[PDB]
Subunit: 310 residues, 3 copies
């Protein structure tokens, strides 16, 4: 039971500052101590310095191609994450990656699927993060991870993204908590027939059923390895006051946590990402002690922490 | 696919000011643009000036009969709504009426049922709005609409309400979200065996099931036309901070919206009212950008807006 | 239909001040008037003066045995509650006990089970309140009631607790709403195979199902008498801003109240405690008008108050 806590302080797909501090902030909440307690031989893994990267981020303002922003910077860092996470996996360690915006999933998913090819991917998020290079209206790369992993709009994908392995197939990615999907993305999910569970399904069926469905969706046979990429903005703002992309009708804190428990309960979780943690963006005290307190909770629950005896 | 957005700035059943501004406020949120986007040929229909009416409202303080207040003023305006909504319907247009307190439903329901006789009525509200003229303790007419449409307490109903057609039958009206029913009203619903779904049923069965039930209740045959009269105070205050009649245990914003989706999904919605929108009553910024933001959302969802591809 | 409203202003298991004012505060909300209205011949029963007890509480700082605090004071007062509640029961009256911290359940449960031996016990709480004398880390007795009633850790239980009857068996106590269980307690529930329903079960199954289960758990035959000991901290803080022991993921106000309705609906409720009501701890106005407004609501609903005709 070895685990590697991958620290990815990247704020590319994200505008300015805030989301790079997540890794450190989480670790301060005792994230590693919690993991050790749950019985995990934990080892940290710093893929790069958030302070330096954040630096070049601000200065370097000419990293663009179309409306797409920071292709070079984002391609450079996500490749390092891929490599790191890939080794961690090969070494037989569990990759727990702490972001950082959701653009890091480009290196995490690639990393995990490279070693675990038949692994399913449950994307817990309010957004589909599947805009293509030419489709993206905002150009923020944290909303285009999936389009790149799935190889959509190949023609328009940068040279700096040639390092991306084509290991993710549409029937291996399921969404949970969607409620802010762009028109372009709605057609994409439909056309590729991607198992997408929006807030409608949670309201209609309840979380338990949705998780069961999402799990079945990426697991033809009830034995496949499973990876969850958890965006904390999935959780309704009321619960995630310290983030940067929420809307009307998110998951309750209870649902957000129960979901984890059902996953831990499954017993086939192979990797986990926790992203979009912005302590700064929220000038209150119950705000900063949330996206990081929430992050640790998600981590603890995902990793087995239960309410009763286990 | 033609629609007529009926503007009814009436604040009769309502004490003083606030609820007459709803129509304009909604339109400012781009309500008509949203409707056009959803593919509706929309045409506005001003039934009267809220500024003038509001005026005579304040001055004219002697409009009473028993504890009942503003019978004359309320009978005068609701008849204009009836007429308007009736034509809109006959012209084959969809009546989307924006209030204004719930006393306008006296003219909306009458209008719609005059043209669509076998139409069912789903009253989404925290209150039953069925107090009789002699039964009403507060005399506020926004809490007596249904008693008049159903012809209860005929003897004590004013001459100014002679214009009201008797088109609504007890087995054609279903409630959803009830939690502030007056003793008198509880006996009335029971005696007339009206399908009433309070917050108890939502807690016990979940919203999806309740909507299904409410829909079945007013649709002997699964083909009848359906009309929803949506009171925004049904939504728990936490979600409707800008209204004027909520209590302990309302619908969540998610439920409030999912309900709409199930209705739009049904495909038999023939008319829709959105009432009790008081921007003023709530001195905050997330308050005024709610009962109007909520109203538009309800409208968009009721009219087909979905989270995924459609 | 006779009822005795037992006033227990005890703040032993509780640190300093606040929770002793609950009884008076509730009565001010018209608790007795509400009970009378629901058709209950109500009679108050003051077991002791909260002002005097609170007094000796502060001064007397040497009441200890191990980490356990106020054993003498807590043993003295809870015995008076037991006696009172026992008579009330024998007189055929319904004991509605208002605390006061949850340490009073030591005298309530004993009192009720003495007269109604086969009575089941539904403990609605965020905590298990089952730490043993030697197990308790904090020494606060409000977290050790159940260990004493069940006779756990006999060896280390004080002489001042010799008055406690051994009437409660493990298969006669069910939990609902658990989410803050100490490691020691988790093993205890498991080992004694106590029916425990945490927030996981509520999220997974919904409240209705949980209550049904809890009721079945303590009722081998669907006829046994039932007692509920309601800790208001079970209700998520958002709803219980005026308490002193909540965490992440409590019951919604709706659930908290629906639960009562299902219980009242059952028809076999024989006793009821409402505890952990701290008006003071919460310097707001919607806070103090909650743990007391909530308490009365719980009482009204538990005692039959419904949303529709009954
Ligand atoms: N990761 C959030 C995505 C937000 C939006 N769809 C975008 O493309 O920027
Ligand atoms: N429309 C709100 C109704 C409130 C109350 N039942 C009344 O008759 O005034
Ligand atoms: N009644 C609240 C219990 C809190 C904690 N388990 C304790 O033993 O103090
Ligand atoms: Mn994302
Ligand atoms: Mn997102
Ligand atoms: Mn109404
Ligand atoms: Mn209403
Ligand atoms: Mn307790
Ligand atoms: Mn407790």
């Amino acid at each position: 039971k070895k685990m590697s806590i991958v620290l990815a302080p990247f704020s590319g797909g994200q505008p300015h500052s805030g989301v790079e501090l997540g890794p450190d902030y989480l670790l301060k909440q005792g994230l590693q101590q919690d993991m050790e307690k749950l019985g995990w031989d934990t080892r940290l893994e710093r893929v790069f310095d958030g302070k330096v990267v954040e630096a070049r981020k601000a200065s370097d303002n000419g990293d663009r191609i179309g409306r797409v922003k920071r292709p070079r910077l984002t391609a450079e860092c996500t490749e390092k994450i891929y490599k790191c996470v890939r080794r961690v996996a090969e070494q037989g360690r569990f990759p727990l990656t702490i972001g950082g915006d959701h653009s890091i999933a480009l290196g995490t998913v690639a990393g995990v699927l490279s070693v675990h090819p038949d692994a399913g991917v449950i994307w817990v998020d309010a957004h589909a993060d599947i805009n293509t290079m030419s489709g993206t209206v905002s150009g923020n790369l944290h909303g285009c991870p999936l389009s790149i992993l799935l190889g959509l709009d190949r023609e328009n994908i940068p040279e700096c993204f040639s390092w991306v392995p084509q290991v993710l197939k549409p029937n291996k990615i399921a969404y949970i908590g969607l409620r802010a999907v762009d028109d372009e993305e709605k057609k994409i999910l439909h056309d590729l027939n991607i198992a997408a569970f929006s807030m409608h399904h949670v309201d209609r069926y309840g979380i338990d059923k949705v998780v069961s469905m999402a799990i079945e969706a990426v697991s033809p046979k009830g034995t496949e390895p499973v990876m969850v990429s958890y965006d904390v903005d999935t959780i309704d703002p009321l619960y995630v006051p310290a983030t940067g992309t929420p809307v009307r009708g998110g998951l309750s804190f209870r649902e957000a946590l129960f979901l984890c428990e059902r996953i831990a309960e499954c017993g086939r979780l192979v990797a986990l990402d926790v992203v979009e943690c912005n302590p700064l963006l929220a000038a209150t005290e119950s705000h900063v002690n949330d996206t990081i307190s929430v992050g640790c909770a998600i981590a603890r629950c995902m990793m087995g922490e239960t309410l009763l005896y286990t």
